[PDB]
mmCIF file with all atom_site columns, C-alpha atoms and ligand atoms in Angstrom:
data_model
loop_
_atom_site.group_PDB
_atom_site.id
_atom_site.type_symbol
_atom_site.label_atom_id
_atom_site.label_alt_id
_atom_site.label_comp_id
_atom_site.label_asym_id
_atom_site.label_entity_id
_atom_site.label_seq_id
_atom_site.pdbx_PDB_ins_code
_atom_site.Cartn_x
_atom_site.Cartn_y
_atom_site.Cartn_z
_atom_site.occupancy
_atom_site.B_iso_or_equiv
_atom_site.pdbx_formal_charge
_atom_site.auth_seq_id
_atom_site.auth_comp_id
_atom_site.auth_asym_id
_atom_site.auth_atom_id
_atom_site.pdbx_PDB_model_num
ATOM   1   C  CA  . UNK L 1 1   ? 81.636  131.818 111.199 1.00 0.00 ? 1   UNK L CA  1
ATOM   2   C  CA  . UNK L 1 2   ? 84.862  131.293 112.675 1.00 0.00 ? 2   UNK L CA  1
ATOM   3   C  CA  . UNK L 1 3   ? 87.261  131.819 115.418 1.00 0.00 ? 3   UNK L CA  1
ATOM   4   C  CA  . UNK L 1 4   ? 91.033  132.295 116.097 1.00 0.00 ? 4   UNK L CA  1
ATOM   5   C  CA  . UNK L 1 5   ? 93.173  129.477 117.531 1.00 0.00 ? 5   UNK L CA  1
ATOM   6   C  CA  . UNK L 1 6   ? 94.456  131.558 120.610 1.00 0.00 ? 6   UNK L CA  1
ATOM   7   C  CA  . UNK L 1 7   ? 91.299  133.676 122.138 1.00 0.00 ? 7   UNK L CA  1
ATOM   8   C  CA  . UNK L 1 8   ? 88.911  132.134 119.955 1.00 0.00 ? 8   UNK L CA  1
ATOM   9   C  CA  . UNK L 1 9   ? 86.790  135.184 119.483 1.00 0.00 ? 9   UNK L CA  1
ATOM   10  C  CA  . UNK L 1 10  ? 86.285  135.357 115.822 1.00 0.00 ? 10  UNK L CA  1
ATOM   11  C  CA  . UNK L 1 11  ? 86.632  137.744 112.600 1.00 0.00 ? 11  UNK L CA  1
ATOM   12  C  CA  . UNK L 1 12  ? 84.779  140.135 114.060 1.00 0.00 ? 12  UNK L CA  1
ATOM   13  C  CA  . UNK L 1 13  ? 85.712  140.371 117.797 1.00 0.00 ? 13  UNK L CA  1
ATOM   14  C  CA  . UNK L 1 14  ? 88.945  139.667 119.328 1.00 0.00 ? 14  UNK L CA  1
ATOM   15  C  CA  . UNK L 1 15  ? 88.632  137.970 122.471 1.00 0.00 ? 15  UNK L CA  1
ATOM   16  C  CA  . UNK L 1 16  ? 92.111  138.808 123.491 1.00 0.00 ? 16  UNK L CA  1
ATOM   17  C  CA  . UNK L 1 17  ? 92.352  142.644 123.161 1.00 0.00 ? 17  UNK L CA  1
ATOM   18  C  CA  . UNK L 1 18  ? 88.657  143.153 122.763 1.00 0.00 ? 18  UNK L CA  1
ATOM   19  C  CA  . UNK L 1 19  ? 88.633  144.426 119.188 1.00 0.00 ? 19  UNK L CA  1
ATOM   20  C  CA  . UNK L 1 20  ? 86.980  143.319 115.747 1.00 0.00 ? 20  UNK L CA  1
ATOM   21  C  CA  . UNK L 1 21  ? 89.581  142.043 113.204 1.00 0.00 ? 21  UNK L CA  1
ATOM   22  C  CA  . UNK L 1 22  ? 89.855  139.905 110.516 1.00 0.00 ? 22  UNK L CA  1
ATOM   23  C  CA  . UNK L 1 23  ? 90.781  135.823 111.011 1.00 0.00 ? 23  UNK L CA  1
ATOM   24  C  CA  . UNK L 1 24  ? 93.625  134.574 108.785 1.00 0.00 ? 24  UNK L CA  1
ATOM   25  C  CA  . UNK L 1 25  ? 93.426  130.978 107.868 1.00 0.00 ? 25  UNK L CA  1
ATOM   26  C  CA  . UNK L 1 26  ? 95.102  128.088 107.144 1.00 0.00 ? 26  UNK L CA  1
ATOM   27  C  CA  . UNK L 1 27  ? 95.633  125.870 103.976 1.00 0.00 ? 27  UNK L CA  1
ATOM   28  C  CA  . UNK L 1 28  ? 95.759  122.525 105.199 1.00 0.00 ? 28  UNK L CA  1
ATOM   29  C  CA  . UNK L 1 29  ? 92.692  123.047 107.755 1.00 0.00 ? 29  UNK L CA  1
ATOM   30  C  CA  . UNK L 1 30  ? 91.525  126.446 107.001 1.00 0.00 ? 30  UNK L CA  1
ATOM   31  C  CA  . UNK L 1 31  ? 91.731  127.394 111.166 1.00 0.00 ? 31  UNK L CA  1
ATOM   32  C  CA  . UNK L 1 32  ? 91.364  130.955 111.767 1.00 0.00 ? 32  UNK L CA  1
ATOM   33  C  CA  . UNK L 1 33  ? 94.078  132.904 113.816 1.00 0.00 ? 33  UNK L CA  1
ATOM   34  C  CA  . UNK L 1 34  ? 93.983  136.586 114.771 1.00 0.00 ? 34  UNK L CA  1
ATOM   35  C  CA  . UNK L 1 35  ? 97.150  138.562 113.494 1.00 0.00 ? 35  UNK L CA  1
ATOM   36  C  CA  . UNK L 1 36  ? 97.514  140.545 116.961 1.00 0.00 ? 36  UNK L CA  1
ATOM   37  C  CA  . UNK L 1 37  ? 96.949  136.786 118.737 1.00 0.00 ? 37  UNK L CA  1
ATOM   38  C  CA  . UNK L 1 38  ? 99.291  135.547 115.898 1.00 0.00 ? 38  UNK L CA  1
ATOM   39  C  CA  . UNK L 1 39  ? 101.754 138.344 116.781 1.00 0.00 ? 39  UNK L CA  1
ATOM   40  C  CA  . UNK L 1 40  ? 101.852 139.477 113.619 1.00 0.00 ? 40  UNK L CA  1
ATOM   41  C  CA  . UNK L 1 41  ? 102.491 142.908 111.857 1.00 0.00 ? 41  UNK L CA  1
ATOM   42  C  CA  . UNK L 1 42  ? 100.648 145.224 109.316 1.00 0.00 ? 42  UNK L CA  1
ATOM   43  C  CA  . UNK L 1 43  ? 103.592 143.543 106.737 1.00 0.00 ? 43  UNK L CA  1
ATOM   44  C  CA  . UNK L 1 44  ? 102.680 139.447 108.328 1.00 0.00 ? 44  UNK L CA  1
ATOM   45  C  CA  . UNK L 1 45  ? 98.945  140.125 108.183 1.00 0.00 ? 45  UNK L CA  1
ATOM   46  C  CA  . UNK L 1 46  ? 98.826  141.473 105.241 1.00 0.00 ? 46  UNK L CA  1
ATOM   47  C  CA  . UNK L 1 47  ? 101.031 138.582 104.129 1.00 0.00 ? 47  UNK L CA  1
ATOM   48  C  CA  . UNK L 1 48  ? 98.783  135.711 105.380 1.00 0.00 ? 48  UNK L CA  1
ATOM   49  C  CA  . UNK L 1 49  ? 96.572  137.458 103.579 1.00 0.00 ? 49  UNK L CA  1
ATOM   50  C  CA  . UNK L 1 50  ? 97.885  137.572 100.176 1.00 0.00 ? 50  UNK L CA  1
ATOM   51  C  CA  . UNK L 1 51  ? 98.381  133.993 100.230 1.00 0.00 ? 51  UNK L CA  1
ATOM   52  C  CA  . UNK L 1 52  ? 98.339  130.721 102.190 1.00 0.00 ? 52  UNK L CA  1
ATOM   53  C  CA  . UNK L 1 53  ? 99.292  131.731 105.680 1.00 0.00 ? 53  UNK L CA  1
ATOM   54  C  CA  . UNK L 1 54  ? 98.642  128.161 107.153 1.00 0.00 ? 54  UNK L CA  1
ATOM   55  C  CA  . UNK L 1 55  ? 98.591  126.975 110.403 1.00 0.00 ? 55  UNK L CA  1
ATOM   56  C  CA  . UNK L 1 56  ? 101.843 126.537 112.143 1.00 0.00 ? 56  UNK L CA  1
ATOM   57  C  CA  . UNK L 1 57  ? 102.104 123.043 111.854 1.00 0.00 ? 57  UNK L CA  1
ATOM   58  C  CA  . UNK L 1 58  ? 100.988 123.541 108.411 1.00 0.00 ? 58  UNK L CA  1
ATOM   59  C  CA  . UNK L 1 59  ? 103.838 125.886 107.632 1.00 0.00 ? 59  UNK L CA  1
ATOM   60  C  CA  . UNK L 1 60  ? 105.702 124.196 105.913 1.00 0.00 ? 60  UNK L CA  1
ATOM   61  C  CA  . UNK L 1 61  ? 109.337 125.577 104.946 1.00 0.00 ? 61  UNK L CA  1
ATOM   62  C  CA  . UNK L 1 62  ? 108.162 127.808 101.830 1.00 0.00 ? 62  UNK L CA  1
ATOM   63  C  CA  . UNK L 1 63  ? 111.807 127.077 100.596 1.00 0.00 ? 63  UNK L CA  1
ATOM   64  C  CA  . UNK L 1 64  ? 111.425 123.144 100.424 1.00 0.00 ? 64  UNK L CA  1
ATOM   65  C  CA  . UNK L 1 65  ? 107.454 123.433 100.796 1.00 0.00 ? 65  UNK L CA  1
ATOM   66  C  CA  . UNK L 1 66  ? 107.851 120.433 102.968 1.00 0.00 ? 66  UNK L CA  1
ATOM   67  C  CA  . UNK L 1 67  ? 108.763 121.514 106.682 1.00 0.00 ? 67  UNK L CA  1
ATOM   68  C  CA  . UNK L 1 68  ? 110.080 118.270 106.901 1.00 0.00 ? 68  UNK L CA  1
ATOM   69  C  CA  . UNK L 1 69  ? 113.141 119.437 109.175 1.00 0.00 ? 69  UNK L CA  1
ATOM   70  C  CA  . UNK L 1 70  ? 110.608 122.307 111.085 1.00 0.00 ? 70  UNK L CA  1
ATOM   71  C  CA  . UNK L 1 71  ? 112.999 121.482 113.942 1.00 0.00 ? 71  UNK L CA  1
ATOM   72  C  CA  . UNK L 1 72  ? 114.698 124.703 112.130 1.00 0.00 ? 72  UNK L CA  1
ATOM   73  C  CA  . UNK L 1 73  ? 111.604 126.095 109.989 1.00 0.00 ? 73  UNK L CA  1
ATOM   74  C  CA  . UNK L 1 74  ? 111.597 129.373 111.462 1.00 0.00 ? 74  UNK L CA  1
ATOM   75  C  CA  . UNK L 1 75  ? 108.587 131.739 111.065 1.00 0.00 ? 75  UNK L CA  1
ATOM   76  C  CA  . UNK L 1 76  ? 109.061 135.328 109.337 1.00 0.00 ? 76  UNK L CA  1
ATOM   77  C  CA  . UNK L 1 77  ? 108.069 138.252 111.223 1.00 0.00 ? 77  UNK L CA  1
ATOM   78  C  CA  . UNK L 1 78  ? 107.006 139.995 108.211 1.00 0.00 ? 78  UNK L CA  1
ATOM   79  C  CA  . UNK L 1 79  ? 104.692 137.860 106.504 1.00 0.00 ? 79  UNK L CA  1
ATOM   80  C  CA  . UNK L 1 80  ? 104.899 134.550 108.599 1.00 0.00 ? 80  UNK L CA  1
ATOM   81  C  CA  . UNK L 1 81  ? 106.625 132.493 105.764 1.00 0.00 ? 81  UNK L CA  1
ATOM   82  C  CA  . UNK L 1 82  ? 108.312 128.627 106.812 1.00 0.00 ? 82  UNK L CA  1
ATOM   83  C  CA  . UNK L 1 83  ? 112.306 128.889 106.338 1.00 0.00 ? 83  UNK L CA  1
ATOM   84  C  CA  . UNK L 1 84  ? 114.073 126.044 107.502 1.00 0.00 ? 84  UNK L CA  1
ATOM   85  C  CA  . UNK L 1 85  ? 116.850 127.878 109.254 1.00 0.00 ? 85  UNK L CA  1
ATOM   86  C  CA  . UNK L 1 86  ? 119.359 126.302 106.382 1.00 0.00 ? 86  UNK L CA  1
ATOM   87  C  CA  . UNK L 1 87  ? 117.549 127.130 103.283 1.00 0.00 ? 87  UNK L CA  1
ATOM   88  C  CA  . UNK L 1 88  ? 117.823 130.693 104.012 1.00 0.00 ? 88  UNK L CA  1
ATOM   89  C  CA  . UNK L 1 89  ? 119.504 133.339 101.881 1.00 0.00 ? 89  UNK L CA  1
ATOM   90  C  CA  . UNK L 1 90  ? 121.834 133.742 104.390 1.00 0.00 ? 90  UNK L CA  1
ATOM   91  C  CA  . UNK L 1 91  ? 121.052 130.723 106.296 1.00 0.00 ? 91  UNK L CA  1
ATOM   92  C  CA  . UNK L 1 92  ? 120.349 131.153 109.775 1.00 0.00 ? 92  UNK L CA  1
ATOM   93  C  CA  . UNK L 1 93  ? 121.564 128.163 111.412 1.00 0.00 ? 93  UNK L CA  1
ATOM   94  C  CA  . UNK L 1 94  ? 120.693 128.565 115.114 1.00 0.00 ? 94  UNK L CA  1
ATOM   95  C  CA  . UNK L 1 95  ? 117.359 130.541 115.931 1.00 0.00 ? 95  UNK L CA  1
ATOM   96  C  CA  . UNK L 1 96  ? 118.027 134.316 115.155 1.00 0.00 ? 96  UNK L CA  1
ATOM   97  C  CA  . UNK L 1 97  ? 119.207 136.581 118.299 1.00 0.00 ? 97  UNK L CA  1
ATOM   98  C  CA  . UNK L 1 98  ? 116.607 139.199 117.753 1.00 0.00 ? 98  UNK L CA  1
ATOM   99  C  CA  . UNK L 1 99  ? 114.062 139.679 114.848 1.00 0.00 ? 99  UNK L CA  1
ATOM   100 C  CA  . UNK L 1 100 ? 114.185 137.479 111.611 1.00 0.00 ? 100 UNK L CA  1
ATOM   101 C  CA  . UNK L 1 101 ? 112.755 137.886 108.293 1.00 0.00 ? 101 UNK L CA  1
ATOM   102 C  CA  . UNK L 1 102 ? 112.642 135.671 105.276 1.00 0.00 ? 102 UNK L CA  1
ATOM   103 C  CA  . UNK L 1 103 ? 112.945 137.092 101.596 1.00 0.00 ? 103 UNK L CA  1
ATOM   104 C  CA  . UNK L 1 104 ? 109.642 137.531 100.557 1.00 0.00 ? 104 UNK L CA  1
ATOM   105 C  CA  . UNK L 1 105 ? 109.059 141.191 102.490 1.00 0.00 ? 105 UNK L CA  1
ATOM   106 C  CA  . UNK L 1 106 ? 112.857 141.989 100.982 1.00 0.00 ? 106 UNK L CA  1
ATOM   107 C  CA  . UNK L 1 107 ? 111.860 140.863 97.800  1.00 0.00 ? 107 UNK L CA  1
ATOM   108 C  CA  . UNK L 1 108 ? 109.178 143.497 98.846  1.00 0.00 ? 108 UNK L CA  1
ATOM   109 C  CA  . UNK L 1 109 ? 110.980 145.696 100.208 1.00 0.00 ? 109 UNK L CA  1
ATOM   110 C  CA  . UNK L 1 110 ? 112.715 146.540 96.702  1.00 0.00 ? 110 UNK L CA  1
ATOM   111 C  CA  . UNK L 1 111 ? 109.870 145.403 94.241  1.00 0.00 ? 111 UNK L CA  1
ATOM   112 C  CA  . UNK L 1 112 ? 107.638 148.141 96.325  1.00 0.00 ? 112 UNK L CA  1
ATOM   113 C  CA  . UNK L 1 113 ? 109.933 150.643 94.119  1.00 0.00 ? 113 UNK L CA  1
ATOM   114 C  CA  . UNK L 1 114 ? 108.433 151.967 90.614  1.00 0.00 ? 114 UNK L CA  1
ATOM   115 C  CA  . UNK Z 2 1   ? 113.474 133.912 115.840 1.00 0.00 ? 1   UNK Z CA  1
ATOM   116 C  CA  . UNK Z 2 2   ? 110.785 131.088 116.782 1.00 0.00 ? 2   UNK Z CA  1
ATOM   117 C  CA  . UNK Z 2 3   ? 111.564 127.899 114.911 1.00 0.00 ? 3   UNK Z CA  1
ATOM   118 C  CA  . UNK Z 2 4   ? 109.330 124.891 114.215 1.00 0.00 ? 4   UNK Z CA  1
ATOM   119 C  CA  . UNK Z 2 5   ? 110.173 122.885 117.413 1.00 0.00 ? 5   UNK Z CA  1
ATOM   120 C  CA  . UNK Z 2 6   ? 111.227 124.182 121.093 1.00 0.00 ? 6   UNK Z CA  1
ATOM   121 C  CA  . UNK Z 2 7   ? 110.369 127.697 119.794 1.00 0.00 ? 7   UNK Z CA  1
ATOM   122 C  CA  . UNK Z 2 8   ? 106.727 126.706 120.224 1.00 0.00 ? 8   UNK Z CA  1
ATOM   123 C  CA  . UNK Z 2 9   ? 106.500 129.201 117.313 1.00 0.00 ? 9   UNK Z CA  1
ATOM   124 C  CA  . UNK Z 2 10  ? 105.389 132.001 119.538 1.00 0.00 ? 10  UNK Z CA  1
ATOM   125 C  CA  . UNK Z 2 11  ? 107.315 134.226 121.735 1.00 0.00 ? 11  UNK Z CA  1
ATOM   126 C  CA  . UNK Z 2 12  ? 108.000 132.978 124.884 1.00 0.00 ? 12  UNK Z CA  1
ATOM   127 C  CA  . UNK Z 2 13  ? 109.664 134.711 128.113 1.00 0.00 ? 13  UNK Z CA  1
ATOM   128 C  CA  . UNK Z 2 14  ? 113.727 135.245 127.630 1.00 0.00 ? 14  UNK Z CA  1
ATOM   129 C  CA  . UNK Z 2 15  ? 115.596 132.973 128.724 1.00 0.00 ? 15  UNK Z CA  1
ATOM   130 C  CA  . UNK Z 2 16  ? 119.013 132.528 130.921 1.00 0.00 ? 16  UNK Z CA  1
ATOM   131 C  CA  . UNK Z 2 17  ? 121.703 132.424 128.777 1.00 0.00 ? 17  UNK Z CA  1
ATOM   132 C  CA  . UNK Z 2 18  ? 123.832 134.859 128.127 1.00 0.00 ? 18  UNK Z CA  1
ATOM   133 C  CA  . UNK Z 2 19  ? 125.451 134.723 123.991 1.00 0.00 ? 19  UNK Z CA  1
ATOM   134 C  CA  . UNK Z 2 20  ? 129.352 133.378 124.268 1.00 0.00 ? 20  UNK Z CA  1
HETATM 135 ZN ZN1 . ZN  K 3 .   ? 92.156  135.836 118.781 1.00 0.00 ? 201 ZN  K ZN1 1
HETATM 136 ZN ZN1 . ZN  K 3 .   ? 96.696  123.739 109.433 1.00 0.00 ? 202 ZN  K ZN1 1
HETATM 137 ZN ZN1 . ZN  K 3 .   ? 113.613 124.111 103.858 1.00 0.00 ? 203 ZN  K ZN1 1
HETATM 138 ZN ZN1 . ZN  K 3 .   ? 108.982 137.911 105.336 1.00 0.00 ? 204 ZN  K ZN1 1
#
């Protein structure tokens, strides 16, 4: 019986639009967070919930799996992955103009093929 | 995108500065 981090509600009522979904968790605590009060998609929630999702803070840059430097560990909008800004494919280097997505929903977006 | 820092990993409100 838990809640998400923003409204709070839990996995079976959101207390921000009013609507029963699913918590994610984390790895490191194992706090609950509502994709839509997360801000995430049908591609990040489904992410978060193929694997460890993990709380922000917790988020560590999937690249170095430390999020040592977060001061660049950006968040995928896709699946919510931890890229420090230069360990990127293409390495981002200053926060992304518009929307930014790490490799995993590429490697996705090809793999989905037969 | 929202990095681990002043991003506050969440989207925030614009803000005034216009890309050189
Ligand atoms: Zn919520
Ligand atoms: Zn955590
Ligand atoms: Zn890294
Ligand atoms: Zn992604």
């Amino acid at each position: 019986g838990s809640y998400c981090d923003f409204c709070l509600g839990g996995s079976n009522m959101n207390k921000k639009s009013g609507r029963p979904e699913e918590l994610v968790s984390c790895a490191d605590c194992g706090r609950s967070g509502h994709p839509t009060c997360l801000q995430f998609t049908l591609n990040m929630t489904e992410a978060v919930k193929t694997y460890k999702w993990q709380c922000i803070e917790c988020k560590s840059c999937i690249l170095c799996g430390t999020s040592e430097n977060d001061d660049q560990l950006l968040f995928c909008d896709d699946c919510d992955r931890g890229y420090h800004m230069y360990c990127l494919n293409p390495p981002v280097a200053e926060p992304p103009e518009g929307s930014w997505s790490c490799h995993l929903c590429w490697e996705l977006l090809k793999e989905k093929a037969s | 995108a929202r990095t681990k820092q002043t991003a506050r990993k969440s989207t925030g409100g614009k803000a005034p500065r216009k890309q050189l």
